[PDB]
């Protein structure tokens, strides 16, 4: 329970409560607490908290923020998590004049893809990957955080919540109103994040759904039935969209080599059926000076 923690600092707030940095009195251990005030809630334990708790109870991985405990202490529900230093947004902003060194960018992407490969193999869509939900420590680790918008997916999927992912990081199959979306949506967000680490500028910083789509179209070229079977039959496709040609990645992401460009290009494939998986991304040559394949059994 709650006696032995003390709140050091308020570090966040959302619809369903407040986040604190907290410290254990003579253990020295620091944690993040999400505090839900149940007396304030009209449907109890918000659906987002039930999902965040249940999902993270079964997702233990070095690159996934650990849920350490859940404490019910009357009128209140506390989720206790490992505390991490900061936020990839804040780290990117602090590094914006200097650049994040390429080897660190590569390390961070590799670790993000390991944590995401893990979610996806356990049938969990994150659905809110953006730099502020990627937490870093002082030892070079990075981790997926804030599973408040995640959900278990079935095989096959069915229609899920449409209002998903922060705009800048939102995949075109969501923006074009597809009946179904899958794991491909999280890879899209990471491909946006990768380029953002490289350029120190958000790749597609839209201010509305249609501006977002047009930003994507102008960079990657307006999709058609050849690159993306079915686009023209999607609920929010319009024949009137302008027909932009794909921009060469040499100009989109100048610091990147051929491997980096190839990876990034596979992460931003229009067609969710062709967009690279987190697992296949790990085997990409970009990560040769990082990793090796495990022996293949037939």
């Amino acid at each position: 329970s709650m006696e032995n923690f003390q709140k050091v600092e308020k570090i966040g707030e959302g619809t369903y409560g407040v986040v604190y940095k907290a410290r254990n009195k003579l253990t020295g251990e620091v944690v993040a607490l999400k505090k839900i005030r149940l007396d304030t809630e009209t449907e109890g334990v918000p659906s987002t908290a039930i999902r965040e708790i249940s999902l993270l109870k079964e997702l233990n991985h070095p690159n996934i923020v650990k849920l350490l405990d859940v404490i019910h202490t009357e009128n209140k529900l506390y989720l206790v998590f490992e505390f991490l230093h900061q936020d990839l947004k804040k780290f990117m902003d602090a590094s914006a004049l200097t650049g994040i060194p390429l080897p660190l960018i590569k390390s961070y992407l590799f670790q993000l893809l390991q944590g995401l490969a893990f979610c996806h193999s356990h049938r969990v869509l994150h659905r809110d990957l953006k730099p502020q939900n990627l937490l870093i420590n002082t030892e070079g680790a990075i981790k997926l955080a804030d599973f408040g918008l995640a959900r278990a997916f079935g095989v096959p999927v069915r229609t899920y919540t449409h209002e998903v992912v922060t705009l800048w990081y939102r995949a075109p199959e969501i923006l074009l109103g597809c009946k179904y979306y899958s794991t491909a949506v999280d890879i899209w967000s990471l491909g946006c994040i990768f380029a953002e680490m490289v350029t120190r500028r958000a790749l597609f910083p839209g201010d509305s759904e249609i501006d977002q789509l047009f930003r994507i179209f102008r960079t990657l070229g307006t999709p058609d039935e050849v690159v993306w079977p079915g686009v023209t039959s999607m609920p929010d496709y319009k024949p009137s969209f302008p027909k932009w040609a794909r921009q060469d990645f040499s100009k989109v992401v100048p610091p990147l080599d051929e491997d980096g460009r190839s990876l990034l290009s596979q992460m931003l494939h229009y067609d969710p059926n062709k967009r690279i998986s987190a697992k296949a991304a790990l085997a990409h040559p970009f990560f040769q000076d990082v990793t090796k394949p495990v022996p293949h059994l037939r």
């Binding site: 009209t42 109870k57 079964e58 019910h72 095989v155 096959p156 999927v157 179904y180 899958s182 998986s277």
Partner: protein, 270 residues
Amino acid sequence: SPLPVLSWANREEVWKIMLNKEKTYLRDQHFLEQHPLLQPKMRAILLDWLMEVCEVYKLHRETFYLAQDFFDRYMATQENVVKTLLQLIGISSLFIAAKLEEIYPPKLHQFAYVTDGACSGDEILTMELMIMKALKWRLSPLTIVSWLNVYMQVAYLNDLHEVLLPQYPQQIFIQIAELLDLCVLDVDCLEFPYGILAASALYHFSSSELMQKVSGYQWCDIENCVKWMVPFAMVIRETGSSKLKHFRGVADEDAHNIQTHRDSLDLLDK
């Protein structure tokens, strides 16, 4: 290894985690021994009523099966429950499940309302917390019907090997689900792994070769279950199967996922 090569992960890995989650989610066929004042037909009456509320609210089969599972697992952690506490524990398992599973679940006052006065919002609130803490917040099982979902997808797999895009006949799925809904009403189903129940039901509507190809179980994995299922299959076969329904406000491509209710209690006597 019923799964195809996956576009999102390692099929060996995915299937193994699926198999292994099935082994952290413990079920107990004799759990009502802990509740001497209860009888198996109370459990079936309770579960049957939940199926009917699900249909009234057009909740998904996955939400009924979550609620069924939370209920059975909760009761195994508990010791002396009385008939009159059942409706609270059941509608509260349903409330958790609907918040987890639905885009727009019924509101708490709607779950109070459907008990016709017997449970208040405040009581459902108290009870969901008791249920979740007692389950140690393990609220992500692979239910009976999710396995049927998996199996049907593989059954109808193309040479374009995408398993995640729904691509099977709505009307046949409904017919196997209706057998499983009968079989969950009998508490001895809990002796067979959820994936076996779903395999055995599909077998009864098809064959051993289909069953085997879509759920990698050999026939001997299934044989015991198949034998137990026999009476239930026959009663269903005798009566004939239901027609796929339309539901107001629900997309037709989602219609087979809506939980339905028939007189399964009558059918359970035979």
